[PDB]
């Protein structure tokens, strides 16, 4: 019997009274619209935005911590090389803004060097992420944003084929150029590749040897969240799949890395975590289309100016519910991203890694995405700050979270009544 319910569960009687009242239902739908703007239209104040940013920053930070220590080398086919030096610029190397892949004779592979094929993949994703972070991520609702990205590497050494026609696509290795246009998203992305040779005795050449320099200029690269998360996923998965050898320089006094030698995928807890964050951020961003597809802006009420009937006049409810559920699901995944990496709940060597390296910068802060001779061995990706801002944004989403729950309960009541 129902009177006997509405004693023991008083807030349910209130819920039913609201579910039969168009003005209360409309008030809930106006709240959904506003909380959706907070989630997908804002940046500083959006928990969703901060959780995306955090997931990206952790991937980038992971590499800033470990890239300098990671061996890479060999030739273009994944093959060993007898004497090849390949230097990638704007990367966090030891006491340098470049990383040098100069490990010969050893076969690239697991617990060996990272092939240059993989390093190219990793590097491209890294340059893109660092350029986007630097300009600032757009709000989640903005997808038609793009960014331009430029990056360079150099090949020296006898027999080094990492800058050749086959590796590059450029017919002429000296002064040549190639344009191609793959389409990431349903978006076109123009890539201009260009090559120049610099002889040993050419003027203004520090390195006493002669080299080829490849420049990549990518235009119209998607800077949306879905796009950038795919880049972070590529970065962390490339690392995890190549699983190259690394060894670190443990600085005097310092914070201390363990293990000192080993293989990059040996950081299982740290990589799992980052992969998890990216996965949860991707599911979170996917809720955006559910929210857009179910606008709550049209007022509801009876028809033929007769009283509202929650049993028949309520077909909007499925969509209201789907929307509210989406917003709620966003907020929970955002929280869950934060809890994956937040050191308050981490333990043992995964905690040392985050508190002593990942959530740390050694640059003299400098803006997001800048790479300096001191970047190595620290995250330099605003991780402590992003965690703090994610928490602040959630704390300031108190009201909206409750409004979403009420909207979901009104809708859910109406979906029930209609059957």
């Amino acid at each position, epitope marked *: 019997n129902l009177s006997k319910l509405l004693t023991r569960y008083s*807030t349910l009687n*209130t*819920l039913i009274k*609201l579910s039969a009242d168009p003005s209360a239902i409309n008030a809930a739908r106006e709240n959904l619209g506003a909380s959706a703007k907070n989630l997908i239209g804002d940046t500083k104040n959006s928990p969703a935005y901060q959780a995306v940013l955090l997931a990206i920053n952790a991937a980038v930070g992971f590499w800033n911590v470990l890239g300098y220590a990671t061996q890479c080398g060999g030739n273009a086919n994944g093959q060993e090389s007898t004497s090849s030096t390949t230097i990638f610029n704007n990367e966090p190397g030891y006491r340098s803004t470049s990383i040098t892949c100069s490990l010969n004779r050893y076969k690239p592979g697991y617990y060996g060097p990272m092939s240059i094929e993989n390093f190219k993949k990793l590097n491209e994703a890294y340059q893109i992420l660092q350029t986007a972070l630097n300009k600032g991520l757009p709000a989640l609702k903005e997808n038609n944003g793009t960014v331009s990205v430029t990056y360079t590497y150099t090949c020296s050494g006898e027999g080094n084929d990492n800058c050749s026609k086959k590796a590059t696509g450029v017919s002429d290795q000296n002064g040549g150029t190639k344009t191609k246009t793959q389409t990431i998203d349903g978006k076109t992305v123009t890539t201009t590749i260009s090559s120049k040779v610099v002889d040993s005795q050419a003027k203004g050449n520090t390195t006493r040897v002669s080299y080829t320099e490849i420049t990549n200029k990518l235009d119209g690269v998607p800077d949306s969240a879905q796009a950038l998360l795919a880049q972070a996923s590529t970065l962390i998965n490339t690392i995890n799949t190549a699983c190259p050898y690394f060894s670190v320089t443990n600085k005097s006094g310092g914070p201390q890395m363990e293990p000192t030698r080993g293989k990059l995928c040996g950081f299982t807890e740290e990589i799992s975590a980052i992969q998890k964050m990216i996965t949860d951020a991707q599911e979170l961003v996917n809720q955006t289309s559910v929210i857009n597809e179910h606008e709550q802006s049209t007022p509801v009420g009876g028809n033929n100016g007769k009283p509202f009937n929650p049993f028949t006049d309520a077909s909007f409810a499925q969509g209201m519910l789907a929307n509210a559920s989406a917003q*709620a699901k966003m*907020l*929970n995944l955002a*929280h869950q991203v934060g*809890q994956t990496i*937040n*050191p*308050d*709940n981490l333990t043992g060597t995964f905690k040392n890694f985050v508190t002593g390296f990942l959530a740390t910068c050694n640059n003299k802060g400098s803006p997001p995405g800048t790479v300096t001779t001191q970047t190595f061995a620290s995250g330099c990706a605003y991780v402590e700050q992003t965690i*703090t801002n994610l*928490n*602040n944004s*959630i*704390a*300031h*989403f*108190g*009201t909206q*979270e*409750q409004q979403i*729950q*009420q909207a979901e309960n009104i809708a859910d009541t109406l979906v029930n009544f209609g059957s």
Partner: nanobody
Amino acid sequence: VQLQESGGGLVQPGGSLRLSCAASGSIFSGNVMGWYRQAPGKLREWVAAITPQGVPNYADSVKGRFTISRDNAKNMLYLQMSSLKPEDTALYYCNRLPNYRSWGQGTQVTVSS
């Protein structure tokens, strides 16, 4: 997976009350925590929140009169209430933000002369 509020009672307008909430570590550690209230005839409304780093924020209806605080050593959450009015009469609940989906029993506060 446990939330226990206490400290509620019947007070006069102008009164003070300190509510307490004993949260488990799961819920409390590294999490934003907050207070809520559910008044006669209404659904549950958010009242205040506080980040792990101790930064507090408040609903307009209580700002300037209520203070929220947290003891990280003992997983405790506190709400100091001042200048109570009849309108503050309600069941008060703590939870984390976003909410763990089982609520404590809550603690009744009644402001009245």
